[PDB]
UniProtKB/Swiss-Prot annotation, chain A:
The gene is MAP4K1. This is Mitogen-activated protein kinase kinase kinase kinase 1. GO terms for cellular component: cytoplasm; membrane. The keyword DNA damage does not apply. The lineage of its organism: Eukaryota, Metazoa, Chordata, Craniata, Vertebrata. Signal peptide: none annotated. ATP binds at residues 19-27, 42. It comes from Homo sapiens (Human).
Length: 285, 293
């Protein structure tokens, strides 16, 4: 990235605790030495001859977002052959971290989450960005009960892959759409949010118990039926309709994020971060 | 310590010194050639006794070493040997834009537009690195033989940084200090938008071969700028320049720093995003320079 700091991140942050890590790198809870504010620092391998294009695109996405519902970005550091991406500290982790302990969320809790995610998606889509990986694991929660979309890794990989693949004159229109856009548009995020709502209500997405390759074939068949909430009586008509409309099969009829923000499930009164503070209290006690 | 990455060795073991390019209070600058590759460098040689304060040179090297961008002069390391500090930097064979226009005369509007775009790219980078150049002018914009525009001479930036750090060390107890006094102590009295103003003056310099008020006593200029009613300068020969150039001058020379556009914002201005802004404009300038020499 053109604006990476060629400086030691430890000169700027005290690494308080390692929060997690794997093949994707490591994530640390850290404190700004000057301000005392908490941040999350993601440390990834970045060696002299490594391919940087995907991490490049991820930083580009983060640096150009300025919206409360997208994780804040505080710059990146290249030091000791590691790239340190400094981002917002969301002290409750992801909704997936939470629901593995609490169990399914209430309808009001899901409605608030969906509203907040839709606010972030409307912003991303207004910038011609697509998240492409909406799911409970990528929706982070801070100690105030606020909701932030995170982890643009898949979006960055696709943005880099599409550019690498980037003569068209013999291509069928459906091939040209893959070469230029990847074969779909920003409305894929709306579908993914509908699946995520089911995930929050039922602790797993539809077909989670089916082999993933069979799932791919099933969804690509003509006649695939969009999924539904299993226990119809547990949920209001508004929630069922939210699922029906977000899981519209044809992208030409699936509503945009801005339009979905007017849906009765997410525009109803009484949706606020207190609903998630309740969830965090259940997680704690 | 001046520099954790300092080379404690004689730079003349690696480089053959060619001509002295310049010299003065700041030290001496030499053209030099790598004994292996034959590549050219510029070496700045400064006196460095064990008793001397290293803070300013430490901060200049820090800027050169950490700020890596296609519009910032390249850095090749530093040497300490026999109480002389040698800062090894990019050889920019055409010298500065001032060296150039003293031979070629005024630049074309397209050439100025290209220079402004390249400088703005370097400034946007520097400002994102939390640095302020503070000495943008034709003499500090170098052109290498590839026609690339490189911001150079961070001596003033380093001096200001060193003075701020020293004054903070002696600020004393803060509990009775007003917030604006604390802000001046931590951040100085102005911000990075000062560089945008300086670029506007530089654009006039490239068009007219002098900055505005060049013939006015420097103390009188300082007084006039602090007067209420001060009018930012303008290009003098209005008909020679396009409305876009006049507007570029108008907005970069916005008097109030709260209303002056950032480097990133200025990069969207018509003058620096118009078609035909390419490196060939600078190579044509260098062709004219070579004909003049
Ligand atoms: C890396 C990721 C997802 O991509 C981004 O773009 C981003 C932006 C801000 C980010 N900030 C942040 N801040 C605080 C936490 C936190 N987790 C906990 C407990 C929760 C229960 O299990 C142990 C840790 N406590 O705080 C956090 N956790 C996440 C989700 O668990 C995480 C941590 C480590 C490794 C991967 C992902 N992420 C993260 C991310
Ligand atoms: C010292 C300075 C400005 O601060 C930096 O950060 C830096 C980085 C690389 C730097 N590299 C470089 N490379 C090559 C030249 C060159 N000048 C000529 C002709 C041009 C016509 O008159 C005679 C010399 N031929 O090559 C050069 N000249 C400049 C501008 O004159 C200069 C030389 C000595 C002292 C101050 C400034 N500077 C310099 C500098
Ligand atoms: Na100079």
């Amino acid at each position: 990235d053109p604006d990476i700091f060629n400086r030691d991140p430890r000169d700027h942050y005290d690494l308080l605790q390692r929060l997690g890590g794997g093949t994707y790198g490591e994530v640390f809870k850290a404190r700004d030495k000057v301000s005392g504010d908490l941040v999350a620092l993601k440390m990834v391998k970045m060696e002299p001859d490594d391919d940087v294009s995907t991490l490049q695109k991820e930083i580009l996405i983060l640096k150009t977002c300025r919206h409360a519902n997208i994780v804040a970005y505080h710059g990146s550091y290249l030091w000791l052959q590691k790239l340190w991406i400094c981002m917002e500290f969301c002290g409750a982790g992801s909704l997936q971290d939470i629901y593995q302990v609490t169990g399914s969320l209430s309808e009001l809790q899901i409605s608030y989450v969906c509203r907040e995610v839709l606010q972030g998606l409307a912003y991303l889509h207004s910038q011609k960005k697509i998240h492409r990986d909406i799911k409970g694991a990528n929706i982070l929660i801070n100690d105030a009960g606020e909701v932030r979309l995170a982890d643009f890794g898949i979006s960055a990989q696709i943005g880099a892959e599409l550019a690498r693949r980037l003569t068209p004159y013999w291509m069928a229109p459906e091939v040209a759409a893959v070469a230029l856009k990847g074969g779909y548009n920003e409305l894929c995020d709306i579908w993914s949010l509908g699946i995520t709502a089911i995930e929050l209500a039922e602790l797993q997405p539809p077909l989670f118990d089916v082999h993933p390759l069979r799932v791919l074939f099933l969804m690509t068949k003509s006649g695939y039926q969009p999924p539904r909430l299993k226990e119809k009586g547990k949920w209001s008509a508004a929630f069922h309709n939210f699922i029906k409309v977000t899981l519209t099969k044809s992208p030409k009829k699936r509503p945009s994020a801005t339009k979905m923000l007017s849906h009765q499930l997410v525009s109803q009164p009484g949706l606020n971060r207190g609903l998630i503070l309740d969830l965090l209290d259940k997680l704690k006690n």
